[PDB]
Design a protein around this nucleic acid. Structure first.
Lengths: 419, 476
DNA sequence: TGAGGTAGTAGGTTGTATAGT
DNA sequence: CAACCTACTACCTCAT
């Protein structure tokens, strides 16, 4: 028998409403039919509607909107509906859904102007309630309400295209692994050789004052000119610890615990970074928690490195790409490189106002996406590298810390579908 | 080359027993879980504050679309989605004229400027509920614009408008944080909105342009406001869909008191969530928790028991029995002296685990092909007690990211206890969906720590309060 | 003087265009 | 105060 209910809609201005009602209705016990539900490759697109409107369609719904009247297909779908309205001879076979407010009485199509309309402008429900009372005032064959059938189309119709595919893919990280450390970390009982008044950043080599010692990767004979009276020191007074015992958790003592050593190694890497940086052709930017390192304008050819831009302008302002390093030991001995954007007025002279540096960084930074962050970050560390893949961080005249610019990748499954 | 695991986006259920993935999409399709039928609106504001409230409440019956509907779906209408009807002519009004504003607001000192205006609303709100027997589901506060700019710290009142001087120099203060505090002994639900939000068309700058550009996002606003309003009236729109029942989530909160001489005094709070997220908040008493040497907050074995029990026994009344699993979320790692305070009161049956969720700066993950970042749900498991989770990044249904750059994961470490880590992750993810004050696809931080600081700022604003266990809808 | 860390503020605009060296 | 996220300062602070 004729039970299927059609909904003829204005595409694509008012496709939003049909998506709201058809799913609402199929769960309320109705077997509905509309051209939003079926994806058609078949050469006969009209052959479906002209058939499904004539024998099995019980009511016809047309959206009386601004673009409802004007669209070609909409008034042509309606043709058969007023043709069959003469067959069963029912005055209210065709019922409109008035959704636009601006349409006066004049602009509405004369086929439907005099027809018993339904106001949806005030509340979409308050019309829907006024509509399905007529569905009860005329006996429309409808099954009891079951919303289990409602969203099964929703997962198939709209959510089917936009869901978690099973495509495997690789992601690149900003964790940069350490090639090799020096062999051992040595401590020196300097006592009176190092003055209480001497700060260790001046040392020209990485050094952290300990309770009685000064920890360093460089050997005790490395800095004598910066700090004299070291020449009296003997090598047997130093307590030495192998590096690979520390990160392997094997070492723990009563005078120093390994979790304390692990805190020392981080600070030495950073000081090692800053020192080697002044050898590497970058201006520094004084931030709160670290120093930032960026490239001056024109210090590379056409401000591009490996066809990758690293320096551009925004409006009058000149923006550069920058980085800031840091250490971490778990899970792996790695070097963490964060990205930053510095702003210059002419290419060389920083903008002193911090207010501009942040408020104009997001004005630019929001514009970038996955491609441009990885492209400019992974290009910048290649620039700081000394040979091909490696970076030489000088922590001794003969003991160095080597870092690989190729960040460790992450494999994964179930990638999203890229638009 | 280490690989990550996908934590499948868990689902939330809706009315009629069917569950979905987006709380905005399913609501129009199904509606809220338990449904009340009447919401009388209690208004407190100026005359202009009325029609601004009248016109907008008149407009949420009408649909308002977004600029990119594919990314934040449309709003059909209140009566259409939630079933409850919200009428404009159903207004209970207690007026606070602008004439009362200028007298009580024009003060030299910010604290007496804020306190006197907070004083004005408390009497007009409490007495409006006391005298009139009218059951008001929620009381709505329409704060005029000229108060928001003038009633915070670091925003002094000009040397011109003043009409009463401060009587001693300066030798909390935020309004909606302070007003919310003196309405805690009176379990009365409140929602504060400025005139700048509902009527952004009127207040312009010099250039003839709106001060706050909502033209693109006018639809999504109907989602945030009209969802959070329905909740405080007494109806929870959605549970979480699939859960092993009998599980508890406790969210820890400290807050250092800057006004005290000791750098350890803090007002502690413990927020519990179950499946619903209506939840309950149990106030912990004040004591020395800030360790200024090490920097982290820690509890004293006395308050941990008086807080877990006052919390857990209320679960013995919420469900008829004791909990089987309890997960404790917090910002800092746990030392040993604190956990023996918890293990001592915990039933011998109940397994207990503490979890450290830090928004640290450990890793970004740059997708190797294309301008779009990795999709939410990837998670690096480093060891069997620590793991990385991407709460931000790309969302496949939405076709837009949630972070406007390469996302930042949150670091989850099982500091105490021992548990299957992948089960915490599949559960921590599900604690993102649950956020009533805004209907969004997901949060970045789980909901157990979402309002940590906003809860903390309520307790410290009034010290003499004895705040009992109260639901969350009285705190938001 | 720097150490680390935590909680106060500030600013931007609702986000993957399309003309054109 | 619609709200999220994500950056970054200077401030008050204690400790070494």
């Amino acid at each position: 028998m004729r039970n299927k209910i059609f909904i003829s809609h204005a595409t694509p201005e008012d496709d939003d409403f049909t998506r709201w009602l058809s799913l609402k209705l199929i769960g309320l016990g109705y077997e509905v039919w509309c051209d939003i539900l079926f994806l058609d490759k078949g050469v006969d697109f009209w052959s479906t509607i002209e058939k499904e409107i004539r024998e099995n369609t019980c009511k016809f719904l047309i959206v009386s909107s601004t673009a409802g009247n004007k669209r070609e297909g909409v008034l042509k779908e309606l043709a058969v509906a007023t043709k069959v309205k003469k067959h069963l001879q029912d005055d209210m076979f065709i019922i409109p859904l008035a959704i636009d407010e601006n349409l006066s009485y004049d602009d509405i199509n004369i086929e439907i102007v005099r027809l018993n309309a339904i106001d949806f402008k005030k509340s979409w429900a308050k019309g829907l309630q006024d509509l399905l009372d007529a569905f009860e005032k005329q006996n429309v064959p409808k099954k009891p309400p079951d919303h289990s059938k409602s969203n099964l189309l929703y997962q198939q119709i709209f959510l089917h295209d936009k869901q978690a595919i099973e495509k495997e893919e690789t992601y690149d990280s900003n964790w940069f692994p350490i090639i090799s450390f020096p062999n051992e970390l040595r401590f020196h009982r300097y006592d009176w050789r190092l003055p209480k008044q001497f700060d260790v950043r001046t040392l020209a080599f990485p050094a952290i004052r300990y309770k009685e010692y000064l920890c360093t990767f460089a050997w005790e004979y490395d800095f004598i000119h910066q700090l004299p009276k070291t020449e009296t020191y003997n090598g047997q007074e130093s307590i030495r610890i192998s590096t690979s015992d520390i990160l392997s958790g094997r070492y723990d003592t009563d005078f120093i615990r390994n979790y304390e050593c692990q805190r020392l190694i981080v600070q030495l890497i950073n000081k090692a970074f800053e020192l080697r940086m002044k050898d590497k052709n970058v201006r520094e930017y004084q931030m709160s928690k670290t120093f930032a390192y960026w490239i001056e304008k024109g210090k590379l050819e056409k401000d591009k490195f490996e066809k990758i831009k690293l320096v551009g302008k925004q409006k009058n302002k000149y923006w550069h790409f920058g980085i800031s390093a840091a250490g971490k030991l778990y899970p792996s001995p790695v070097l963490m490189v964060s990205s930053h954007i510095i702003f210059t007025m002419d290419g060389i002279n920083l903008i002193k106002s911090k207010s501009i540096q942040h408020s104009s960084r997001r004005k630019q930074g929001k514009n970038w996406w996955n491609d441009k962050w990885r492209e400019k970050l992974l290009a910048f560390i290649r620039f700081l590298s000394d040979d091909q893949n490696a970076i030489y961080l000088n922590v001794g005249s003969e003991e160095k810390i080597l870092i690989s610019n190729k960040p460790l990748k992450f494999f994964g499954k179930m990638s999203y579908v890229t638009p | 080359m280490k690989e990550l695991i996908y934590i499948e986006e868990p689902s939330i259920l809706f009315a009629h027993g069917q569950k979905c993935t987006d709380p905005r999409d399913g609501l129009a399709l199904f509606g809220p879980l338990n449904q009340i039928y009447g919401i009388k609106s209690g208004v407190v504001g100026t005359q202009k504050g009325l029609q601004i409230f009248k016109s907008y409440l008149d407009k949420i019956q009408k649909p308002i679309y977004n600029h990119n509907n594919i990314t934040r779906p449309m709003f059909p209408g209140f009566e259409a989605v939630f079933g409850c009807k919200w009428e404009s002519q159903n207004i209970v009004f207690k007026e606070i004229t602008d004439e009362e504003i200028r007298r009580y607001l024009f003060n030299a000192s910010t604290h007496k400027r804020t306190y006197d205006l907070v004083t004005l609303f408390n009497d007009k709100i409490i007495t409006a509920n006391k005298n009139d027997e009218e059951r008001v589901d929620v009381w709505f506060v329409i704060v005029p614009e000229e108060i928001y700019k003038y009633c915070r710290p670091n925003s002094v009142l000009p040397n011109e408008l003043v009409q009463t001087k401060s009587l001693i120099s300066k030798s909390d203060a935020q309004f909606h944080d302070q007003l919310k505090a003196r309405l805690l002994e009176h379990t009365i639900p409140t929602q504060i909105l400025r005139e700048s939000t509902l009527a952004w068309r009127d207040f312009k700058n010099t250039f003839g342009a709106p001060i706050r550009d909502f033209s693109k996002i006018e639809g999504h606003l109907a989602w945030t406001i009209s969802t959070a309003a329905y909740y405080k009236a007494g109806g929870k729109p959605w549970k979480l869909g699939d859960i092993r029942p009998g599980v508890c989530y406790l969210g820890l909160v400290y807050k250092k008191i800057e006004k005290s001489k000791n750098p350890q005094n803090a007002c502690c709070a413990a927020q519990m969530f179950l499946d619903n997220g209506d939840g309950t908040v149990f106030k912990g008493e004040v004591g020395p928790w800030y360790n200024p040497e090490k920097g982290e907050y820690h509890l004293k074995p006395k308050e941990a028991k008086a807080l877990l029990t006052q919390a857990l026994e209320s679960y013995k009344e919420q469900n008829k029995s004791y909990p089987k699993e309890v997960f404790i979320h917090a910002r800092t790692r746990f030392n040993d002296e604190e956990w023996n305070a918890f293990n001592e009161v915990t039933p011998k049956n109940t397994n207990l685990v503490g979890v450290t969720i830090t928004k640290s700066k450990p890793l970004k993950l740059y997708k190797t092909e294309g301008a779009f970042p990795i999709m939410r749900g990837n998670a690096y498991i480093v060891d069997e007690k620590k793991a990385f989770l991407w709460t931000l990044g790309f969302v496949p249904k939405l076709q837009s990211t949630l972070s406007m750059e390469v996302p930042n994961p949150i670091f989850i470490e099982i500091n105490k206890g021992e548990a299957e880590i992948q089960q915490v992750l599949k559960d921590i993810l599900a604690l993102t969906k649950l956020n009533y004050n805004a209907c969004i696809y997901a949060d970045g931080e789980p909901v157990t720590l979402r309002f940590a600081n906003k809860i903390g700022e309520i307790l410290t604003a009034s010290t003499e309060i004895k705040t009992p266990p109260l639901a969350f809808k009285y705190y938001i």
